Amino acid sequence: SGRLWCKAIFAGYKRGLRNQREHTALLKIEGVYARDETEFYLGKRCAYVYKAKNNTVTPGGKPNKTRVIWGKVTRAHGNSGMVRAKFRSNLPAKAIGHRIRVMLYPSRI
Amino acid sequence: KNLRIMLKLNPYAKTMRRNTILRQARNHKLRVERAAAALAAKSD
Amino acid sequence: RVKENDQKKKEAKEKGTWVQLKRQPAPPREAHFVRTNGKEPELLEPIPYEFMA
Amino acid sequence: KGKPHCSRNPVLVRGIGRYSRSAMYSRKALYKRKYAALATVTKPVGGGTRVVKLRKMPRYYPTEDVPRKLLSHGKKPFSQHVRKLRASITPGTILIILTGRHRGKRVVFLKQLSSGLLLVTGPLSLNRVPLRRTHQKFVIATSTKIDISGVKIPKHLTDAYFKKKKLRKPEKEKYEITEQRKVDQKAVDSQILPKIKAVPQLQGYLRSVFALTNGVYPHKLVF
Amino acid sequence: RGLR
Amino acid sequence: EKAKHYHKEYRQMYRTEIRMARMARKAGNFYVPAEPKLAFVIRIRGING
Amino acid sequence: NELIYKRGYGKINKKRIALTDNTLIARSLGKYNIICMEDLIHEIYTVGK
Amino acid sequence: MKASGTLREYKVVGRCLPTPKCRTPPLYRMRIFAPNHVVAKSRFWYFVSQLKKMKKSSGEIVYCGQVFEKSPLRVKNFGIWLRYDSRSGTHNMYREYRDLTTAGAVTQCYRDMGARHRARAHSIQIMKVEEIAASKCRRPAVKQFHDSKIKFPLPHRVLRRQHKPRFTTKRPNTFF
RNA sequence: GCCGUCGCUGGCAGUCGGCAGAGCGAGAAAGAGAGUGGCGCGGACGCUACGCCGCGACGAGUAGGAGGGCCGCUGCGGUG
RNA sequence: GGGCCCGGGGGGCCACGCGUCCCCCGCGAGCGCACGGGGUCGGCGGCGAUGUCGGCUACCCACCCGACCCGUCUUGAAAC
RNA sequence: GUUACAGCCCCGCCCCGGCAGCAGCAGCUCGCCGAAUCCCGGGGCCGAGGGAGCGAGACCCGUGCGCCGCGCUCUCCCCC
Ligand SMILES: [Mg+2]
Ligand SMILES: [Mg+2]
Ligand SMILES: [Mg+2]
Ligand SMILES: [Mg+2]
Ligand SMILES: [Mg+2]
Ligand SMILES: [Mg+2]
Ligand SMILES: [Mg+2]
Ligand SMILES: [Mg+2]
């Protein structure tokens, strides 16, 4: 067993300077620091994974405190490897600067 | 972007495209044939 | 123009031809050839500044 | 009635034939191929007979009904969709599974089933993955291949063979490995396994598990 | 007519 | 058939201008093509002020 | 070509109608012998009568 | 004119429109360094207007075409005669450049005239461009490359890949 | 995509059914004309016409004007 | 180059009945696939009775971005 | 000082001296294009509408893949 996802940081939301578009998240991925290295990740699944107080069901498992908001990478962002991600619900602002998981599927290689 | 939509408007588009596909494939073959002849000539 | 129009309208009618009657704005000039007559075009250059004060 | 003949217009591209109308007309010889202009069942009864109505009118009508749909085209059922496959996934290719309990295990691709799902084997003796179906979008195809060109896979290994059989609970109900499945596992494994052992260290590779580690980034490394 |  | 004819017409117009210029150059002269008859205009400014 | 094909809308009965059928052109401009997209492209491109 | 990108040399031929008085007006030519041809024709009408009683309305462009460099693979010294307006006058200058294409030397001129004199390209009128032999050059910066046995190192080679890696264990080396 | 407004002073009385026969969107006026001589008993919804349906464009607003409120309050005649 | 790319002596054609006079020299049948008048599957998986599933808005709390107190006179009000 | 033990530039004749190649997979030495332009692939968002009829017909009461556009096959016979 071992890790099967790439380490990403929830950098912030899509924004100008004084307007915030919370439906899109800007993700920084480890080792991706050019716009041309982001092509592998486009369309990949993203998962903000966290813990809460009340137990919740787990697919293929028994209830625990883990929770996840799913999303996927939609496009690159800027010249330095950032990608825009969209989630089934807008990410909470408390998650900025914290881990976002980037999966290896849907695989295109 | 939609072939059958273009033909409902301009039926002659189908002839034009078929000729292009055939002409371009024919032209590609010659460039390959002309290349092989020169390469073999260089080998000589 | 009315008198000229009517005559052309009348005269052309008996000769079975269609002539233009309506004026038109000046069209873009049509393609043509410029003969050089074996003379190279004169080269022009900007002149130096001079304080002719 | 004549026998069907293969289309005389070879496909140049999708929707365009190789030959024009007049070219096809000559090819089909259309110059000489010219042409010119129950509901009731009667039965006996012990009246003598009755005219029986095959289908009877409804005995109940809902207060409201929905209208019909407008007709569309190109919306085929799943069974009629065309199946695609990545050029990198060729039979004998080693795939890394990304999901399920077997995630991270390197398996051997055998063939694509009629539903587009992939057939893979562990083989069971190397990583404990049996003859199993998997989805191509959820695997990573490596560049490591073995030649299973001479392997005969049973023809009864179809989508219907691998489809889950529903289990009813009123406590639980446990899946049981059928004896046919075990026999099939040895039939396929007994051929693929020797081919695995020809490649040095390959068997150890199939026992190991894939994982991402410090400084290893998927976009950088060849599989 | 000719077509027929 | 109208499209088939316009295709030939467009080709003749395109080839004709090239042929005209080639013969002017051959003779050492200049072929000045016809001033364009058609323009496509695009509005690039808003409606304020 | 690309302008009239991708973004060609007729002004028919003072409405904006996508030119998805040749009949749309023929009914309105047929009296001038413009009856298909190619005739419409030819009239515009060559600045016909 | 905006000296956008590398300029090109254009050969522009124009004349007065023929009239009953002069059925064949004389032809004039100009060397125009511009970004594209649409700009090239515009600047032609600006120069001939300054020299002749002519302008776009009462004249036509007989020929506009790009003049290609004749020896793009050979090093040359260029002399450029130009006049420009400063904040407080007009001046004539002679400058020299070393390049492979005459249009490259002119592009160097605009970037250089902007750098050393804050001269925007709308104030610069390039009068003349000539290829000059090494013996006839005047500028010491150009003459020092006229040395058959020229040699020199590359001291203190600055690190240009300063964010790959952004954080590193070893300090860079500037000596090579 | 959805809401409303404006426009087409747009379409629908044709639900013309076994006293039946299913159309009137179509580039280019005017008739799915009339005649005189040479087995089963069946066939959705609709239409408060102040109703229902379609298509296209559009939508800032103080002072001010107008419309619509199956918005709200109290009492009277009818009605439930 | 243009003349349905004039006339004479390997490759594509939205050529393909014929009686004729002669410039010139009004209905065939079927069947099938679809880049064809706006999406469907005639495709699947997991979990579920005492701790779990769904509940926009609403109650409390947190975070990110935004955010000056209304009415009024006024050219101008968050106005000291 | 003038090709020598390296080379550079210009001019005449050598078919513009001859050969590749040709806005070059020497994947960057310099352009503008596509009736002189086609093929394929990847990611993202979305699915509004809901009776379009077809053919048999007054010797028929069926069937809901129906318009327009583009194809295929059969009503001929051979060969691989
Ligand atoms: Mg402004
Ligand atoms: Mg308003
Ligand atoms: Mg703030
Ligand atoms: Mg504040
Ligand atoms: Mg006040
Ligand atoms: Mg005051
Ligand atoms: Mg106030
Ligand atoms: Mg104050």
Enumerate the H helices of chain A as residue ranges. Answer: none
**Alpha-carbon separation of residue E3 from D23, D27, D29, D34 (angstroms):** 18, 18, 14, 8
C-alpha span between D159 and D119 (Å, rounded):
9
C-alpha span between D61 and D59 (Å, rounded):
7
Contact of chains E and D by CB distance (3 or more pairs under 8 angstroms):
yes
C-alpha span between A85 and A12 (Å, rounded):
11
Do residues A79 and D110 make contact, with C-beta atoms less than 8 angstroms apart?
no
Task: State the structure-solving technique.
Answer: cryo-EM
Q: How far is A36 from chain H (nearest CA, A)?
A: 14
D13 burial via Cβ count (<10 Å: 0-12, 13-18, 19+): exposed
**Alpha-carbon separation of residue A85 from A104, A108, C29, F43 (angstroms):** 15, 18, 58, 35
C-alpha span between H136 and H125 (Å, rounded):
23
C-alpha span between D22 and B39 (Å, rounded):
41
Do residues H151 and H100 make contact, with C-beta atoms less than 8 angstroms apart?
no
Longest CA pairwise span in chain B (Å): 55
Torsion of CA G31, G32, G36, G37, to 10 degrees: -140
Ligand 5 centroid – CA D193 distance (Å)? 96
Torsion of CA G38, G41, G43, G45, to 10 degrees: -140
Burial code (b: 16+ CB inside 10 Å, e: under 16) for D25-56 equals eeeeeeeeeeeeeeeeeeeeeeeeeeeeeeee
| Cis peptide, bond prior to residue D200, ω within 30 of zero | no
Provide the 3-class DSSP secondary structure of residue G23.
Answer: helix
Which nucleotides of strand J lie under 7 Å from a protein CB?
Answer: 1-2, 5, 12-18, 26-29, 34-47, 51-54, 62-67
Q: What is the resolution of this structure in A?
A: 2.8
| Cis peptide, bond prior to residue H20, ω within 30 of zero | no
Tell me if chain H has a CB within 8 Å of the CB of C34.
Answer: yes
C-alpha span between F39 and F44 (Å, rounded):
15
C-alpha span between A30 and A23 (Å, rounded):
23
Q: For H156, which DSSP code? A: S
Q: How far is A80 from chain H (nearest CA, A)?
A: 11
Q: How many CB atoms lie within 10 A of CB A16?
A: 7
Q: Quick one: tokens of A22?
A: 């919370």
Q: Quick one: tokens of C9?
A: 């309208």
**Alpha-carbon separation of residue A2 from A46, D105, D216 (angstroms):** 18, 11, 12
Tell me if chain G has a CB within 8 Å of the CB of B12.
Answer: yes
CA D135 to chain centre: 10
D215 burial via Cβ count (<10 Å: 0-12, 13-18, 19+): exposed
C-alpha span between H52 and H83 (Å, rounded):
19
Cβ contact B33 with chain J strand, < 7 A = no
SS (H, E, C) D149-160: CCCCCCCCCCHH
Burial code (b: 16+ CB inside 10 Å, e: under 16) for H2-27 equals ebeeebbbbebbbbbeeeeeeeebeb
Provide the 3-class DSSP secondary structure of residue D123.
Answer: coil
Residue with tokens 């040749």: G22
Do residues D80 and D207 make contact, with C-beta atoms less than 8 angstroms apart?
no
> Which of D136, D141, D212 comes nearest A4 by C-beta?
D212
Looking at the DSSP bridge assignments, the partners of residue G46 are none
Burial code (b: 16+ CB inside 10 Å, e: under 16) for B1-39 equals eeeeebeebbebbbbebbeeeeeeeeeeeeeeeeeeeee
Q: How many CB atoms lie within 10 A of CB G38?
A: 24
